[PDB]
Scaffold this active site. Structure first.
Site, mmCIF file in Angstrom:
data_model
loop_
_atom_site.group_PDB
_atom_site.id
_atom_site.type_symbol
_atom_site.label_atom_id
_atom_site.label_comp_id
_atom_site.label_asym_id
_atom_site.label_seq_id
_atom_site.Cartn_x
_atom_site.Cartn_y
_atom_site.Cartn_z
ATOM 1 C CG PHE A 1 -2.089 -0.926 1.063
ATOM 2 C CD1 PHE A 1 -1.883 -2.308 1.163
ATOM 3 C CD2 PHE A 1 -3.366 -0.443 0.816
ATOM 4 C CE1 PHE A 1 -2.932 -3.199 1.000
ATOM 5 C CE2 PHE A 1 -4.438 -1.327 0.645
ATOM 6 C CZ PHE A 1 -4.226 -2.697 0.743
ATOM 7 C CB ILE B 1 -1.949 5.921 1.000
ATOM 8 C CG1 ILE B 1 -2.636 4.579 0.728
ATOM 9 C CG2 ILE B 1 -3.029 7.010 1.180
ATOM 10 C CD1 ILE B 1 -3.269 4.475 -0.634
ATOM 11 C CE1 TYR C 1 3.098 7.231 4.997
ATOM 12 C CE2 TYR C 1 5.072 5.827 4.887
ATOM 13 C CZ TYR C 1 4.195 6.626 5.617
ATOM 14 O OH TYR C 1 4.395 6.829 6.972
ATOM 15 C CD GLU D 1 2.910 -4.085 15.088
ATOM 16 O OE1 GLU D 1 3.635 -4.097 14.055
ATOM 17 O OE2 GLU D 1 3.169 -3.419 16.117
#
Ligand SMILES: [Hg+2]
Ligand SMILES: [Hg+2]
Ligand SMILES: [Hg+2]
Ligand SMILES: [Hg+2]
Ligand SMILES: [Hg+2]
Ligand SMILES: [Hg+2]
EC number: 2.4.1.40
Lengths: 271, 271
Positions: free
Chosen positions: B58, B60, B63, B229
């Protein structure tokens, strides 16, 4: 299906499990020694799946005498708490002892007139009745826990005479004319024919492969030095086992005593 | 399908693999450290199966900047020799860098408006296109081999900050109101959300379980301390991973240096 809450010692990342023995193969299969597993976790995992374990044993001619001790000790030590189906292959159904079995455990007597019997005659029945199949010799007794820690798609057991030996010293079939041939620069371990197993599917694959290879050998007028053990070793060389059992699982105390590396002697030759 | 003849060092039964670290969990899952595996054997096994590995990432907002280094280094180090399909989830398809890929490797850009995206939107596609799925963070680079030694039905990776820590010290979710709750007397390891995976089926099961648990939490007005997590750790507590990756596979050299226990630094935080 999810495991319940359980309280047990935290695994220690920076403490080796054993410092005296190899506990994983180069293809990342566990080598099962005492200390490597938490049996409560494993029991939970396999009970949640309602695991049934088939144990196959051949008892021909004088070997029928070993059945009473074999089955009585299996009742005390083998897969206790799990569903077990013993398959006794014999030329003497009437000589099979009447051994009292715990709940969830059953015994079938199958009359014979090993690799052809597991793969050929019994294939459909096993797929229907059990999840895992274990093949052992009858002239043996259980002396300690043999449980679900062994279960995996395909396992072999370290032969007690060779576990510290060089591959050159292994009594593999060495004639290139045999389907079981393994040269001196090949070989991981020497596996004993007396204790192997896995899922029904993988055990049938193995016994089918061995049986076909033995027929090739026979048509070629050659017989492997150690018969189906030679073939078993070839198969497990070319199809790596997903677990390997330490010699705790196949020992001979008369022959080999009780060395320091064995914390438990689980399944042993009868003198 | 049978492995070919191969020449490699014989495994040594009476020599521990490592004397500094734990190389197998109490449920008999390998803990993958350098020295534990022969990559040639593993490569053969997985190539014979024509294994395809999906990598999901991913990227986004800001990033997207990490993508070029992430993919370029993945090309050098990740599953080289095997079929790879990168799945890049982004809000900026046009900002995805054009990175040159080796043969047998492909990249799909999937526009978004993580656990719902893997389990919900992409379930059919993944079952169709890949054998294993790996989920990693984008702000990372590969610096050494990350290969098929990781592949298994279900794996988690040891968080680099906690691998030597007591279970009491783990930053699990500690509020009983959260679906992710783990009490102080439970827990095997602290797994990092930044690197997990397994078969498509097991990864979908996990991401479905997590997503459903997170929605429960949300409806109950609670958010786990470390988000997905926290949920990953709960899932892997109750569904034991079939392999665990050592911190070689998820490291931060700036934060944590290069300690003696790490023979290789494979996949690392970008400063
Ligand atoms: Hg241990
Ligand atoms: Hg064979
Ligand atoms: Hg065999
Ligand atoms: Hg090793
Ligand atoms: Hg979860
Ligand atoms: Hg999760």
């Amino acid at each position: 299906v999810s495991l319940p809450r359980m309280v047990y010692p935290q695994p220690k990342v920076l403490t080796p499990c054993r410092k005296d023995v190899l506990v994983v193969t180069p293809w990342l299969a566990p080598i099962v020694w005492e200390g490597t597993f938490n049996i409560d976790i494993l029991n939970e995992q396999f009970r949640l799946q309602n695991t049934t374990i088939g144990l196959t044993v051949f008892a021909i001619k004088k070997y029928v005498a070993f059945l009473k001790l074999f089955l009585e000790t299996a009742e005390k030590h083998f897969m206790v708490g799990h569903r077990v189906h013993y398959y006794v292959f014999t030329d003497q159904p009437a000589a099979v002892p009447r051994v009292t079995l715990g709940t969830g455990r059953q015994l079938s007597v199958l009359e014979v007139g090993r690799m052809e019997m597991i793969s050929d005659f019994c294939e459909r029945r096993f797929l229907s009745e059990v999840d895992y199949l274990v093949a052992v010799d009858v002239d043996m007794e259980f002396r300690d826990h043999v449980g679900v820690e062994i279960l995996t798609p395909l396992f072999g057991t370290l032969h007690p005479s060779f576990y510290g030996s060089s591959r050159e010293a292994f009594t593999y079939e060495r004639r290139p004319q045999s389907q079981a041939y393994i040269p001196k620069d090949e070989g991981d371990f020497y596996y004993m024919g007396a204790f192997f197993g896995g899922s029904v599917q993988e055990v049938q694959r193995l016994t089918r492969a061995c049986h076909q290879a033995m027929m090739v050998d026979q048509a070629n007028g050659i017989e492997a030095v150690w018969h189906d053990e030679s073939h078993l070793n070839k198969y497990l060389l070319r199809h790596k086992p997903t677990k390997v059992l330490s010699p705790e699982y196949l020992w001979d105390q008369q022959l080999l005593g009780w060395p320091a590396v064995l914390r438990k002697l689980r399944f042993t030759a009868v003198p």
